[model samples]
Target: PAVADKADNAFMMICTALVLFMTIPGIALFYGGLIRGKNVLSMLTQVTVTFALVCILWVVYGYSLAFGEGNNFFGNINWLMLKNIELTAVMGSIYQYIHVAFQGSFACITVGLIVGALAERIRFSAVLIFVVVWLTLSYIPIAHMVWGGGLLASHGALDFAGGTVVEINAAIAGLVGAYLIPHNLPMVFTGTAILYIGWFGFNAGSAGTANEIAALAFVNTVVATAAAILGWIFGEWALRGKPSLLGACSGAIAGLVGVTPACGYIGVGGALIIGVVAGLAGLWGVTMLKDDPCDVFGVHGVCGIVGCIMTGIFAASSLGGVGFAEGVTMGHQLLVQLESIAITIVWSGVVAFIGYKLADLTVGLRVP
Candidate 1:
C-alpha cells in the first residue's frame, strides 16, 4: 500500500497547479486591481519577481533546510539541490517531484500574500531583500514546524496551510508603512474569480492521493465560500444598508481562508459554519484593521486563527469532524490552536521586523 499510485500522481500535479495558479495570476491581480492603478504594476512586479526568487532559493537550499529531518527548530541540508533522491522515489503515494513542486508554490504564495500591503514607496531592492530574509528565516523554519515533522507538527497543527508568512506582511506593513486602494473595480472581481477557482486545490492535503479526502475537501470549499459570500453580505446589509460586491468578494477570500485548516477536519455543515463565522469576523477585522488596503491581514490573520479555533471545536466525532487525537479533548485542542497562533505570529513577525530593519539600513524604507 506504500507503493505509488498513478492516478494519485496525476491528480496531485493538477492540485499543485491549482495552488500555483492562486499566486501567479490569482493573487497578483487580486492585489493588483485593489491597489491604485498607479501602483498596480508595481505590486505585480514584486509578486512575480519574488516568486522567481523563492523558487530558485527553494531548490538550491530552502527546501533542504525547511523539509529535511533534523531537529525541532530546523531541518538538515541533505536535500540541497534535491540531491540523492531518485525519480523513482515517492512522497507517500506519488512521485516526490510533485511534492517538491507543490511545496515550492506555497513558498512563493507566502510572498504573494504579504506583498499586498507593502508601502507604496518601498524601493524595489528593499522589497526583494526583505522577502529573501523573511522567506529564509521565518517561512522555512515555520513550515518545518508545522509540516515537516518539527515541533508544531509534534504538537498537532492540522495544516493545509502556507499560513506562517501571511502575517509577515501584516507585522511589517502594519508596523511600518503607507499604502493604496481600489482602482479597477471589474479587475477586482476578475482576480477574485481566479482565487475562488484556485481555492479548491484540496489535494495539497491529499498527499498525492486522488480519493475521498480530496473530493470531500472540494465540496466544503465550495459550500463554505457560498456561505461566506452570503454571510458577509448579510452583515453589510444589516450594518451598511447595502451589500456591496466588494464585500461579497472579500467574503469569498475570508471563507476560503477560514475553511483552510478545517478542510481535513470539519464536514460540510461545519465548513459552512466556519465560513459564516469567518465572514462576520472578517467584516469586523477589515473594518478595524484598516491600516492598509487588500485587507490581507483581516482576511488571513484574523480568519486564519478563527478557522483553527473552530476546527478544534468542530473536529469531534459528535460534531461531524474526523475527531480529535487520542486522549485529546476540546479544551486541550483549543489551547493547541491558540499556541500555534502565537507561534506563527511571533516567529514570522519577528523575522519580518528584522528584515525590514535590515532593508531600512541598506536601501531605506520610503522611496521618492
Candidate 2:
C-alpha cells in the first residue's frame, strides 16, 4: 500500500519547485514593483529570509502538526522533522517526501504573500516574529482544517488548491495586519507574468498526478487568466476610459486567484465566467477599498471569495463540471463554501491580531 511511483515522484518534485519559485523571486518582484524603490531591498530581504524561516519551521514540526492526523483542528506529531518514515513511503500516488515538500511550498508562498503586503511599514524583526506566530497559529491550523483530514476536509469542503487555505487565509491576514500602509509598474507586470506561468504548477499539481485533471487545470488557468485580463481592461476602460499596464497586471492576478479553487472542479466555460467576474470584482475591490494600503483585501480576498462561492455553482454535472459528491446538491455545497469562508475569515483575523500583537510586544510592529 505504501509503494511509491517514480514518475509521480519526479513530477511532484518539479511541481514543488515551481510552487517555491512563486515566492523566491515571483512574489518578491511583485511586491518590489508595488512598493517604493527605497524599501525594495529590505522587503526582498524580508521575503527571502522569512521564507527560510518558514521552511525550517515546516520541517521541524509544522508538517506534523498540519498533516499527521490527530483531530479536527490539529495533526499528530508523529512526523515531526519528517521522521519515522521511509524514503519509499507513499502519499497519494507520490512519495511521502515529495508530498512534504509540495505541501511545505504552499506554506512558504502563503507567508510571502502576507509579508509582501506589510513589508513597507513593518519592522524586519517584527515581520519575522509575526511570521513565526502567524504561521504556527493561523496558517498551520487552517492548512490542517482544510487539507489535513481536519474539520473542513472531513466536512467535505472543496479546496482544490488553497482557495481558502492559501489565498483567502493569507489575504485576510494581510488585511487584519493592514490596520496600516510603488515605482516600477513594468517590474510589477513582469512579476505578474511569472506568477501566472508558475500557477499551472500550483493548480495542476494539486491533483497529485500527471493526469486529465492536471491537463484541465492547466488549460483552465490559461483560459481564465486571458479572460480576466480582458475583463479587467474592459472594466477599466469603461470606468476610467483607459486601460493601464497596472490594470492588466491586476487583472492577471484576479484571474489567477479566481480560478484557483474551481480550476479542477469546473469546465472551461465555467472558468471563463469565473475569470470575467473575478476581474470585475478585483477592480471594484481595489477601487472601493482604496483606503487599504496595498489592495490585498481588494484583490486576493475578494477574488478568492468569488471563486470559492462560484465553485459550488459550477462544480456540478449540470454546469459541465466534474460533478459533486453523492447526494450533495449545489445549494448544500454553496452553504458549505460560505461556511468555510466565514470560518477562515475569523480564524485568520484572530490569529493575525495575536501575531501582530506579539510582534508589537517583542520587536515593535512598525518602522520609524
Candidate 3:
C-alpha cells in the first residue's frame, strides 16, 4: 500500500506539471499564432496575467468553496485559504494540499479560456474584475455541484476533465467576446496547438495514477484527436475544395473537447466516434459564427456537448462505463447528462452576462 501510495503521489506531481504546461507554451503559443502579430502579444499577456490572478484566487477561496466539507449546494469555507489545515490531510491517496493545487490549476485554465480572446477588446481592469466574479460565482459552484459530491455528481453526471466548466462556460464567454473584438484567426490556430498538447494532462491526469485509467485516457486522447483531424479535413475538402490548416487544427480541438468527458469511461472505438462527431460539429459551429477568432464556442462548447451526450451512450457497461447503477439505465444516464449540459449552458450564460454587465457598470467592461 505504501508503495502504491508513493507511486500515486509521484504520478500526481507529474500530472500537475503537465497541466501547467498546457497554459504556458501550450495555450499561449496556440493562441499567439492565431492572431495578427500585433494583437498576439496583447492576448498572450492577458492570458498570462489572468493565469497568475486565478492561481492566487483559487488557492485562497476557490478551493474551499468547491471541495470543503459541506452540504449539497457547496462545500464549506472551513478550508478558506486552506486555514488550519495539515498538509498530510488525505483526500484519497494524495495530500490535501496536492489536491488543492491540482484542482486549482483547472480554475486557472478556465480563466485563460475567457480572457485569452477578450484580452484585445476588454479593459484590463474590467477583465480582472470579471475574473474574480466569474471564478467565484460561476466556476466554484459549478465545480462543487459536479465534481465535489454536490447535486450533479450525486445524481451521476459525468465529466472526466471539464466538459461543462472549462468548455461550455468558456465557450459562451468567448462567443460574447467574439461579438465585440474582431477575431484574430492566426491566433486561434496557435492556441489550438497549445491546447492539444496540454490536453494530455487534462484527460490523462484525471486518472490520478499512472495506471490503467491513465493509459486508457492517453490512448483515447490520440485516437479521438486523430479521428477528429481526419473528419474535419474530409469535411473541409468536401466543402471548401481544400483542407485548410486552420480547419485541421480546429478539428483536432473539437475531437479533444468531445472526448474529454468520456475519456475515462469509454473505449477506443467510442473515442473515435466521439472525435468524428465532435470534428464535424466544430466545423459547423465555426461556419455558423464566421467572425470568431479563437473559435472557443465552436470547438469547446459544441464539442463539449457532443462529448457529454456521447458519454451517456458509450459509457454504458456494455461500452465501458462504471456501469449500471441502482435503478438507473443508459437512458437514465443520457437524460441526466443532458440535464447537466443544459443547466451548465444556461447558468454560465446568465452569470456571464450579468457579471460582464456588472463589471462594465463598475470598471467598464471594454477598452476605449
Candidate 3 lDDT by residue in tens digits, 174-271:
67656544245565576676677778878988887777888988899999999999999999999999998788888888898899888988888889
Query: Can you tell me which runs of candidate 1 are displaced by over 4 Å?
Result: 162-181, 202-207
Candidate order, lDDT descending: 2, 3, 1
Off by over 4 Å in 2: 291-293
TM-scores of all predicted structures: 0.94, 0.98, 0.94
Index of the highest-lDDT prediction: 2
The C-alpha local distance difference test score for the whole of candidate 2 amounts to 0.89
lDDT of 1 by residue, 109-158 (tens): 66777775573557888888888888888888887888889898898766
Worst 10 residues of 2 by lDDT: 289-298
Evaluated at residue 272, the lDDT of candidate 3 is 90
Candidate 2 residue lDDT tens string, 204-271: 99889888999888898998898999999999999999999988998999999999989999999999
For all candidates, the clash counts are 0, 0, 11
What's the distance in Å from true for residue 224, model 3? 0.7
What C-alpha lDDT, on a 0 to 100 scale, does residue 353 get in candidate 1? 75
